Design a binder for these strands. Structure first.
Ligand SMILES: [Mg+2]
Ligand SMILES: [Mg+2]
Ligand SMILES: [Mg+2]
Ligand SMILES: [Mg+2]
Ligand SMILES: [Mg+2]
Ligand SMILES: [Mg+2]
Ligand SMILES: [Mg+2]
Ligand SMILES: [Mg+2]
Ligand SMILES: [Mg+2]
Lengths: 53, 125, 109, 128, 240, 225, 63
RNA sequence: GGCGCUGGAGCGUCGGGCCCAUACCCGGCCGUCGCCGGCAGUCGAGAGUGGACGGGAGCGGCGGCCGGAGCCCCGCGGACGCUACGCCGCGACGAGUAGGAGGGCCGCUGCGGUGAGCCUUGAAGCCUAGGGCGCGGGCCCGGGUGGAGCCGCCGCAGGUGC
């Protein structure tokens, strides 16, 4: 699975396939890590904050 | 993978209902509508679901095809059965058992089809 | 026709000096004043019969004011012929010093 | 008449009364909600005889009959019709309460759908 | 096949036979009875009839269920006892023998003295304090709710009719066929009717019970009177 | 292959049934032999005393080698040495009983905890009643009731003890594997003495209940369980 | 009353990883099954090491 | 301790009965701890404390002394389960200030997501001899009042519980 990369068809503006294919980028086989995503989201949502006192 | 996606969505899902010391799952293909790895209707490579027909007569048995796993527009095949109750249950039994298409959901699908038909028959006085 | 039940007195609950076990009651049967005479009454049904304000259904009869708390003699108590009784609900404390009927029902003679 | 549960065991409650807070009878400022006494001399905390009883785990209900209503069903709260079809396969052991804030015209539809699905509603005549 | 034999191992206490394993081996002659070595059609074929319907139909019996409930109950474990009530062994108190005068403690015949005839198949006693004496017909009673007195009449070699059984004395009910919602009163038939058969049976039994009652002095007055507890008398000191 | 596998399963089941039958016969005959041994000992003591009295001498019986020890006082306010010796005797609760093999070391241990225990010399009937009514084994650190002989066999079979009768024999006649057989048994959890005690705070010889009563421990046991 | 001491009743040990790493949890499931259904003590050791913390799983140098 | 008690309800020595503690024994239920216990076998055909082959030479029961391959099918069928952070089994245990730790589908306010959530056919708040749930913190539902907003779930953050 991780080493296997299918071909995704590119769809035209009319909704149907255009006959062109792109090999699946390897980033879509990266480890799905919800705990790391939650940690990064938690710590970066604090950076747009505005002080109150 | 099914187990990986289950570890992702076992507690974080928009189909998850946690109320009154009970838990439920409302994804489309969930027989028994319970939050469980066996009955989840999204994470498995093959799934079966039973719904009421568009008009209130018959059932729609939907099965997940093998090929288009990432293609949700063509990943499910829906067939409508509008026979008598015994024939409908026999058809569902044959679809699950003869095909060996998830034989662990056979009685769940049969019971759900029975519930749907019993709901569809006219009320009494 | 006749009385058909032995008279008893609700003497009190099973108790220590400063603790009271209301689930079981002590009955003083009239004429039974030794422990060895109590063997007849063991297991017999007993009834606390009283009256109230509202009518209640009477089995095999018309509704009336009579109400019953049923029970039975369980064992002997003391040397002087006390008996212990278990009732379906614990006897009210207003019944202390009042009549209990021992009904002879589960006869062994 | 009413829909019956799958099984109706004998529900045994170890305690039927409520655990009232110590000295909640003597003050209006003290609500009856249970609070653990932590005074140094507190006789209720020390468990003297004839006092207010303190809740503990020994009063816990049987796990088989925990959360059962007197009818034998177990309660689930629903807000619209869509949340009612989760009980379709839990029919014989779970009943539905329509939430208090659901409007009358919507709870009519919920009641009728539950009647179709043979689901029990504990408040089926609640806004009419 | 061979004719069944009796046990050949007499019981001396329940669960223990009189003869040992080897003794029973020799009594059975197991030394010469030594052995070494040597259905239901669910579907029926039926002629369907009609041209070109094929030959016949393989019609199965016990078709599969049309409906399945949403959930069921697991089956029970096995109990290796707990026989039904019709197979219980019936126990009778040693003080109750046929002809004994009993005292009814419950029912509308409370306190009356009746004559015991026989224990029925359900363990209920069949009694008759003859109807000409105290208005107690051939009637069932429970041995737990009677007092067995010491006075007896020899009712041996009297003929209790064979049809007098539990099914004979069982209560009969009418309601409620062809009637579900009660808008019109269904209190009819509440008058229980004494059957001519019952009257004939009562006459037949009493005709041979009464002469044995009259044979002993003032027993009939005893049977006419009812039992009561005087204030001075106590049942634990009373000899019955 | 269906007929072959049927034959294989039938042969295996029949071999297992034959093994069970042989083991049951062995248990039966061991119990018979133990009965013979018990009556031989009981008659031997009487016969020895009789010949001594005939000769005009005195026959002193062997000092009893088995004791039953029952803890009669509670767990409040116990000196550390008494508490330690009670833990070593496995008497951590009031009205707990344990079989103790008697020698100098164990006798001195009993003397230390004398005010807290009542002990004596059980007889064959007392041993039988204790093992049969209240016998529990310490199998995998769990208190398991001795409802089958397999429970004894799986824990003590390596010592030749395979049944309730073997356990009772090893306890009564203090055998080679008495330590293993006794530690296999969970300490007996006996009820309160029906009919009450005399005085739990004094010695038996002074009207109480503590200490060594020689063979009245059997009277105590009958009421105790 | 029973004369025992309760301060050592609860054994302090890792029964599961404190981490929420789903891949680690999946292979913990795998070795839980293997340790249960095999007689290999290697699987037991590996499972209990998978439970362990990072300081109890020090890095191993190539040398 | 009081009333009282003197052929004792006093003193000394003793007997038999009987009374009851949250103690002991049996049973039920709750929780904790232990077995780092069992379950991925949903395996109605799985069948396992060895099976395979593969020729040696032999018996034992049926196929006149030569003799042998079996595959489920008159039924096409067969409960539940396994949120594995789940479910199940067995055993022992349960006092607690100061203090420590865990769990909280206990509660408050706000934020990111989510509930094709709720709501003028009536939100919040409040009142209630109304119905219930939970050991409990608390919560849900009915009725009334009210008249415009509010809540569940997954995370996040506190000026968060008298
Ligand atoms: Mg409550
Ligand atoms: Mg208050
Ligand atoms: Mg203090
Ligand atoms: Mg002390
Ligand atoms: Mg007693
Ligand atoms: Mg402690
Ligand atoms: Mg305890
Ligand atoms: Mg504690
Ligand atoms: Mg503050």
């Amino acid at each position: 699975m991780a080493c296997a990369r299918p071909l995704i068809s590119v769809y035209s503006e009319k909704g149907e396939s255009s006959g062109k294919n792109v090999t699946l980028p390897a980033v879509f086989k990266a480890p799905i890590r919800p705990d790391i995503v939650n940690f990064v989201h938690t710590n970066l949502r604090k950076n747009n904050r505005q002080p109150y006192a | 993978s099914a187990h990986l996606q289950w570890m992702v969505v076992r507690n974080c899902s928009s189909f998850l209902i946690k109320r009154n010391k009970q838990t439920y799952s409302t994804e489309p293909n969930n027989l028994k509508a319970r939050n469980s790895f066996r009955y989840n209707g999204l994470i498995h490579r093959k799934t079966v679901g039973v719904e009421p027909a568009a008009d209130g007569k018959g059932v729609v048995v939907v099965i997940k095809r093998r090929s288009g796993q990432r293609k949700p527009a063509t990943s499910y095949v829906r067939t409508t059965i509008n026979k008598n109750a015994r024939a409908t249950l026999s058809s569902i039994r044959h679809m699950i058992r003869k095909n060996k298409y998830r034989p662990d959901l056979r009685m769940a699908a049969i019971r759900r089809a029975s519930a749907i038909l019993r709901s569809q028959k006219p009320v009494m006085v | 026709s006749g009385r058909l039940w032995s008279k008893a007195i609700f003497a009190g609950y099973k108790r220590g000096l400063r603790n009271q076990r209301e689930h079981t009651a002590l009955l003083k049967i009239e004429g039974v004043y030794a422990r060895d005479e109590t063997e007849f009454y063991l297991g017999k049904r007993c009834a606390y019969v009283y009256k109230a304000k509202n009518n209640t259904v009477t089995p095999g009869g018309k509704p009336n004011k009579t109400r019953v708390i049923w029970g039975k003699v369980t064992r002997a108590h003391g040397n002087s012929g006390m008996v212990r009784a278990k009732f379906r609900s614990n006897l009210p404390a207003k019944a202390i010093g009042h009549r209990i009927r021992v009904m002879l029902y589960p006869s062994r003679i | 008449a009413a829909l019956r549960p799958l099984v109706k065991p004998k529900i045994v409650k170890k305690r039927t009364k409520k655990f009232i807070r110590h000295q909640s009878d003597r003050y209006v400022k003290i609500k009856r909600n249970w609070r653990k006494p932590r005074g140094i001399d507190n006789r209720v905390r020390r468990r003297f005889k004839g006092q207010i009883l303190m809740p503990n785990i020994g009063y816990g209900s049987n796990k088989k009959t925990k959360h059962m209503l007197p009818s034998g069903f177990r309660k689930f709260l629903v807000h619209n019709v869509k949340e009612l079809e989760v009980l379709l396969m839990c029919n014989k052991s779970y009943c539905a309460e329509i939430a208090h804030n659901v409007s009358s015209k919507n709870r009519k539809a919920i009641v009728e759908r539950a009647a179709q699905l043979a689901i029990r509603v504990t408040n089926p005549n609640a806004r009419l | 096949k061979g004719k069944p034999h009796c046990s050949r191992n007499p019981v001396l206490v329940r669960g223990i036979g009189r003869y040992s394993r080897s003794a029973m081996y020799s009594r059975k002659a197991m030394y010469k009875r030594k052995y070494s070595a040597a259905k239901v059609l669910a579907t029926v074929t039926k002629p369907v009839g009609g041209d070109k319907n094929g030959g016949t139909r393989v019609v199965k019996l016990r078709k599969m269920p049309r409906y399945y409930p949403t959930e069921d109950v697991p089956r029970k474990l096995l109990s290796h006892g707990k026989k039904p009530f019709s197979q219980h062994v019936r126990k009778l108190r040693a003080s109750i023998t046929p002809g004994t005068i009993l005292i009814i403690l419950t029912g509308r015949h409370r306190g009356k003295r009746v004559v015991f005839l026989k224990q029925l198949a359900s363990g209920l006693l069949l009694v008759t304090g003859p109807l000409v004496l105290n208005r107690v017909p051939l009637r069932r009673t429970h041995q737990k709710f009677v007092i067995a007195t010491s006075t007896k009449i020899d009712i041996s070699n009297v003929k209790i009719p064979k049809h007098l059984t539990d099914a004979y004395f069982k209560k009969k009910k009418l309601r409620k066929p062809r009637h579900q919602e009660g808008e019109i009163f269904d209190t009819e038939k509440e008058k229980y009717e004494i059957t001519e058969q019952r009257k004939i049976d009562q006459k037949a039994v009493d005709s041979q019970i009464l002469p044995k009652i009259k044979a002993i002095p003032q027993l009939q007055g005893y049977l006419r009177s009812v039992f009561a507890l005087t204030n001075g008398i106590y049942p634990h000191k009373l000899v019955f | 292959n269906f007929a072959e596998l049927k034959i294989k399963r039938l042969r295996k089941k029949f071999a297992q049934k034959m093994l069970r039958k042989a083991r049951r016969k062995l248990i039966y005959e061991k119990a018979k032999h133990y009965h013979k041994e018990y009556r031989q000992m009981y008659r031997t003591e009487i016969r020895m005393a009789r010949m001594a009295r005939k000769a005009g001498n005195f026959y002193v019986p062997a000092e009893p080698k088995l004791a039953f020890v029952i803890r009669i006082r509670g767990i409040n306010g116990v000196s550390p040495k008494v508490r330690k010796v009670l833990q070593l005797l496995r008497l951590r609760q009031i009205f707990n009983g344990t079989f103790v093999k008697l020698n100098k070391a164990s006798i001195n241990m009993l003397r230390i905890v004398e005010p807290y225990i009542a002990w004596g010399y059980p007889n064959l009937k007392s041993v039988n009643e204790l093992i049969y009514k209240r016998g529990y084994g310490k199998i995998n650190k769990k208190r398991i009731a001795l409802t089958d002989n397999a429970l004894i066999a799986r824990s003590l079979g390596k010592y030749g003890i395979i049944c309730m009768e073997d356990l009772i024999h090893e306890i009564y006649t203090v055998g080679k594997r008495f330590k293993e057989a006794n530690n296999f048994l969970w300490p007996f959890k006996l009820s309160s003495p029906r009919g009450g005690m005399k005085k739990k705070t004094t010695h038996f010889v002074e009207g109480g209940d503590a200490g060594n009563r020689e063979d009245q421990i059997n009277r105590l046991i009958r009421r105790m369980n | 009353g029973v004369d025992i001491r309760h301060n050592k009743d609860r054994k302090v040990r890792r029964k599961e990883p404190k981490s929420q790493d789903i891949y680690l949890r999946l292979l913990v499931k795998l070795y839980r099954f293997l340790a249960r259904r095999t007689n290999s003590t290697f699987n037991q050791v590996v499972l209990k090491r998978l439970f362990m913390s990072r300081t109890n799983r020090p890095p191993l140098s190539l040398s």
